[PDB]
Amino acid sequence: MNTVPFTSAPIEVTIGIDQYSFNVKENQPFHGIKDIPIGHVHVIHFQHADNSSMRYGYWFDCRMGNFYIQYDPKDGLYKMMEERDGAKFENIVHNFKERQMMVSYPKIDEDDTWYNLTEFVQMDKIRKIVRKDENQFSYVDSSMTTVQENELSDPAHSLNYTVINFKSREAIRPGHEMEDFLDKSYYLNTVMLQGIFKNSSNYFGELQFAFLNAMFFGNYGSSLQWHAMIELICSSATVPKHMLDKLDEILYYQIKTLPEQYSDILLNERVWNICLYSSFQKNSLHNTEKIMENKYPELL
Amino acid sequence: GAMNSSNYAELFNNDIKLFVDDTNVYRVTVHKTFEGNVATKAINGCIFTLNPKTGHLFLKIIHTSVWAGQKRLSQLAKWKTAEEVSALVRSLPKEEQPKQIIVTRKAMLDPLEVHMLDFPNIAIRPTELRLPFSAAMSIDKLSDVVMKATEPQMVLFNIYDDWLDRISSYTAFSRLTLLLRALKTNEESAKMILLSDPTITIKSYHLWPSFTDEQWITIESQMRDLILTEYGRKYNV
Numbered sequence A: 001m002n003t004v005p006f007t008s009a010p011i012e013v014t015i016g017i018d019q020y021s022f023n024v025k026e027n028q029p030f031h032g033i034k035d036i037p038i039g040h041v042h043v044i045h046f047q048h049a050d051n052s053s054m055r056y057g058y059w060f061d062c063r064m065g066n067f068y069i070q071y072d073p074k075d076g077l078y079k080m081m082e083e084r085d086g087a088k089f090e091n092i093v094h095n096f097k098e099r100q101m102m103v104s105y106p107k108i109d110e111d112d113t114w115y116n117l118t119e120f121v122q123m124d125k126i127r128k129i130v131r132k133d134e135n136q137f138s139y140v141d142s143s144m145t146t147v148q149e150n151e152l153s154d155p156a157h158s159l160n161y162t163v164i165n166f167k168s169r170e171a172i173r174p175g176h177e178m179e180d181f182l183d184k185s186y187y188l189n190t191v192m193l194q195g196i197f198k199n200s201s202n203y204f205g206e207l208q209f210a211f212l213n214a215m216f217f218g219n220y221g222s223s224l225q226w227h228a229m230i231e232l233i234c235s236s237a238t239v240p241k242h243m244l245d246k247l248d249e250i251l252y253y254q255i256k257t258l259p260e261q262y263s264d265i266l267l268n269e270r271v272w273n274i275c276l277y278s279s280f281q282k283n284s285l286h287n288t289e290k291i292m293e294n295k296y297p298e299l300l
Numbered sequence B: 001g002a003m004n005s006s007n008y009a010e011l012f013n014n015d016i017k018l019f020v021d022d023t024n025v026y027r028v029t030v031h032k033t034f035e036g037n038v039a040t041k042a043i044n045g046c047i048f049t050l051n052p053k054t055g056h057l058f059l060k061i062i063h064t065s066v067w068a069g070q071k072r073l074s075q076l077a078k079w080k081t082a083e084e085v086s087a088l089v090r091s092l093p094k095e096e097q098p099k100q101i102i103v104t105r106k107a108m109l110d111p112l113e114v115h116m117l118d119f120p121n122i123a124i125r126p127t128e129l130r131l132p133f134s135a136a137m138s139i140d141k142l143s144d145v146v147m148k149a150t151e152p153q154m155v156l157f158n159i160y161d162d163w164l165d166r167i168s169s170y171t172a173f174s175r176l177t178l179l180l181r182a183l184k185t186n187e188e189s190a191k192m193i194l195l196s197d198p199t200i201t202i203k204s205y206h207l208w209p210s211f212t213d214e215q216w217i218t219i220e221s222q223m224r225d226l227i228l229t230e231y232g233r234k235y236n237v
């Protein structure tokens, strides 16, 4: 188990660690989060009590270094940093544990939720989507726009998701205009899976990472990307059976976890009704369709 | 954006543009089989592509052989239309290529957009207008070349005859649309009107009769009346 210590908590803030979130009061004696499961990526994330605007946060993996949080009063936010002096880090963590000023990552032993939501997400791929190579962790917030969004303004602070565009020369082979637009299998299997992503794990990892940024930060372009990647699969007549079955599991946990009150802003009526009811894969997402119809029949 | 009553004069500026209408592309007669089931038989169709400023019509004839062995013809028809319009644009010198293509049914936007991906600078637009181009097969000479075709074929017409020697393209397009609306509302009456006086003939190289200025005014008034009168009865005035 790993720890992310906090130098202090000078401003009132709601702190999130993956699906768990807790309130910290202005100058409450809070010094971090312990018992964080090793083996998965994680996201810590903040919403200042004063400004519900700008939820932001940091993806990280505890195997890639010793990380801590420290408020910056010039820039006005909780900043993640790396401690390179490993002896200094163990010493600090131990003192804070002894004095019991850390919350425990509160995982129930039955609960595979976080794993199911991050199965294919890898830090190495996150750092390619969020470019900032001097840090081992990656910052995201509500307002960051995507590379495709910038094509339709600061390229350094963007989400470099893979561009998917159904009405593009990439998507559409000359002479198969109708065939390729109505059955996207060529674009899915050859262009994207074999050409760009190399395998379905990498494809699913971007898809889960887009969902997670949409759900935790309401990053509109992330939500756009998640729906695009679902639609590309659903609108392909020929998809390996193992991908379909995995996709049903992925989406199932995403819908299970999605907060009920953000379902109107995070779910696209058109994409879901199409994927569940019109697409080639309309009979291939049994678990997803069952949960969608019992939890959000209003959308459908 | 969409074309409607308010950006109507844009049709007659000097930006090249085409209307594409696909309503006569896939045509069928419905009939009964020996067993008492229903079956369709396709008949020749045509893509109606018109430059509203010059009158030039590019009538792409769609021979029934192009449907042989195909499924979901109504859907294929939209893609076939887009394919042919795209070939037409590509066949034209650059300086004659359109800057806009206005489709008369929204179902054509996506098929045309996909086929025109190589022309990012050509705007594909819908319209809110209820234009009567479907009545083009009520024009005897156009119907005749469509029905006689034995292979795919493109035929070129000027749908305003020589009108532009005397009227503006705005006035020409208004005349054409009144004639076609009339033909769509009541074809028999519309045609009786046009041909009653056997002394006013259709030149061999024309589609409509050789009326004088004053005779067009009378004709135009008669087509307005006929169109009035079925609005005088369809909504029980």
Ligand SMILES: Cc1cc(C(=O)Nc2ccc(N)cc2)co1
Residues within 6 Å of the ligand: A016, A018, A019, A020, A021, A055, A214, A215, A216, A217, A218, A259, A262
């Ligand atoms: C505008 C907006 C607020 C939020 C939000 O708070 N998300 C979130 C936060 C925590 C958890 N567990 C789950 C989801 C998303 O969009």
